[PDB]
Ligand SMILES: O=c1ccn([C@@H]2O[C@H](COP(=O)(O)OP(=O)(O)O[C@H]3O[C@H](CO)[C@@H](O)[C@H](O)[C@H]3O)[C@@H](O)[C@H]2O)c(=O)[nH]1
Ligand SMILES: O=c1ccn([C@@H]2O[C@H](COP(=O)(O)OP(=O)(O)O[C@H]3O[C@H](CO)[C@@H](O)[C@H](O)[C@H]3O)[C@@H](O)[C@H]2O)c(=O)[nH]1
Ligand SMILES: [Fe+3]
């Protein structure tokens with residue numbers, strides 16, 4: 077029979093991780109008698125008097141938040157890393173070894189509006205969000221080789237506070253993913269003489285099958301090797317090492333691309349769409365980081381609808397990540413909707 | 424200053440995967456205003472007239488389940504892999520490439536009792552399950568190099584049907600986890616001339632800090648490099664390549680170990696403790712597999728209680744797995760409860 081990706085299971089390679097993804101095109105056909113998701117409330121007040129993240133509010137620690145009107149960053153009250161933790165008793169033990177971990181964790185409130193997420197923020201407000209990301213990265217980068225900007229959106233994504241915002245965790249070392257991505261990109265570069273992701277963008281631009289968002293300076297695709305159902309990869313069309321290297325134009329364009337990307341997500345099921353997202357750029361290790369290409373990953377759990385997510389469990393944990401629909405199907409569904417948040421368009 | 428694992432963040436290495444785990448011992452003290460889990464109901468019928476996995480019931484596809492006893496295995500009505508899928512077009516492209524994928528998927532009903540989870544089952548019944556896992560492994564191993572026995576238990580673990588049971592997915596290739604575990608174990612062996620987990624078992628025996636369950640032939644510990652809060656690694660004290668290689672004594676002993684382990688898990692929060700678990704053993708690839716050591720991993724998501732789980736999200740996906748308590752603290756908590764199921 078003729079192989080048909082559209083219908084035959086197969087594995088696809090993730091050149092960033094050196095790992096495969098198993099695709100079973102029709103897995104989703106099976107009866108779902110599992111957990112039903114809890115979709116989020118449409119009606120939240122712009123200011124919650126109890127919210128530990130709201131402006132002019134006291135934190136769990138008593139610390140009072142400023143009367144902030146744009147973004148706001150403060151050191152996490154429960155940081156995952158400290159800048160002066162004692163060094164660990166590092167050894168060579170092939171079985172039980174440990175290593176030192178220093179760094180910090182900061183919290184970023186997107187805006188004082190307790191009820192408005194990224195797709196609902198103005199391009200101007202989004203641009204401030206980017207400037208803050210850059211600011212944070214430049215400062216921490218001065219001290220730590222790995223600065224990780226991210227965000228957990230929605231209960232399904234492990235958020236512990238409903239205020240819109242993100243986090244920044246800095247590390248004295250290169251975490252798993254960073255070291256891997258770093259090495260893999262470096263090898264490709266050494267061999268191909270061009271940045272892996274830069275070449276990837278070209279290919280995607282010429283194809284279109286997986287394109288979701290395309291702006292003057294950015295591209296958002298459902299990567300070939302996507303893991304999560306509607307997972308996306310957001311990249312600059314031009315070669316850029318870190319977030320801190322974006323030009324002002326790329327910067328405002330990024331704000332636009334984000335709004336569009338997240339609006340499509342929310343438009344997909346006509347609901348606030350949960351996800352985990354974050355930025356990957358060259359580490360501040362003082363090395364030649366030409367092999368790098370800045371990029372953001374978006375990992376959303378929703379699959380069938382607003383109340384049915386994907387669960388990366390048994391097989392995925394013990395063997396390999398699996399997907400129940402192609403990246404092409406995912407991208408197509410994402411292209412079908414509007415890139416204007418339903419709340420803003422009034423449709 | 425003076426380093427103390429329960430107070431200071433640090434990273435631990437997982438030699439099975441060659442990856443690190445970030446430990447931040449006081450992270451769970453933060454307020455939690457996130458999701459609240461829904462704990463599984465305690466009272467369920469022994470037979471559910473509408474259950475697709477229940478004895479004598481008609482499946483989704485209309486096929487009928489027999490009036491079985493003990494375990495019941497059938498080919499998944501929506502298998503994720505097939506035995507005859509056409510080969511993919513293989514290339515050596517550095518950015519966009521695919522590979523073939525063949526195999527099968529089977530469903531294993533633990534017993535005809537719709538309401539009895541593993542720890543609720545007798546050692547005899549559990550022994551029957553072990554026999555089936557073995558038969559299934561030996562069987563599929565004839566055709567596939569990778570046989571994956573597993574179980575998704577509880578809503579939080581993405582289970583799609585409440586009947587107590589698991590799955591077996593076979594693959595014509597070695598999936599990610601298999602390939603790496605094989606490679607790393609092989610490397611270790613070549614250098615140490617001893618199996619990685621065999622040595623590991625001894626090192627743990629000589630410590631006891633992370634021990635949770637210990638029987639004549641098995642050991643269950645919160646691995647040194649544990650990711651999930653109360654994760655455990657279950658393994659035979661003696662070198663055993665695959666589950667099919669167990670002696671009958673080892674097998675009957677494994678059932679005992681399983682009952683004990685799972686009873687402790689349920690007792691931790693006095694609820695049916697969810698998890699994803701599976702078995703890892705030598706692949707059927709006709710190669711020198713002495714480096715292998717059979718073992719089971721249990722990945723339970725619960726963290727603070729019956730309604731609050733651990734989430735591997737943002738930082739974890741973009742950077743590195745992280746934990747809010749030490750392997751040692753968790754092991755202690757597990758040891759603190761009775762190995763007698765709270766509802767026996
Ligand atoms: O008064 C307050 C209230 C909250 N916070 C912080 O606000 C953050 C909100 O972060 P969010 O992204 O919602 O989730 P977290 O509580 O950090 O935990 C999630 O994100 C982590 C990093 O991905 C994971 O390790 C957890 O398992 C996952 O639940 C938390 O870190 C809190 O420590 C404060 O600093 N002060
Ligand atoms: O009439 C029926 C009813 C059910 N089933 C099968 O019963 C199985 C029950 O397996 P379970 O462990 O409960 O979950 P799954 O539905 O397979 O899916 C989970 O397990 C997979 C393997 O880890 C993941 O890919 C998913 O994302 C995760 O939700 C399913 O696969 C069904 O296809 C049949 O074959 N016939
Ligand atoms: Fe990346």
Ligand SMILES: [Fe+3]
Nearest residue numbers: 439604703720
């Ligand atoms: Fe393993």
Ligand SMILES: [K+]
Nearest residue numbers: 228235241242
């Ligand atoms: K958030």
Ligand SMILES: [K+]
Nearest residue numbers: 575576582588
């Ligand atoms: K199950």
Ligand SMILES: [Zn+2]
Nearest residue numbers: 127130190239
């Ligand atoms: Zn708020």
Ligand SMILES: [Zn+2]
Nearest residue numbers: 474477537586
């Ligand atoms: Zn049943």
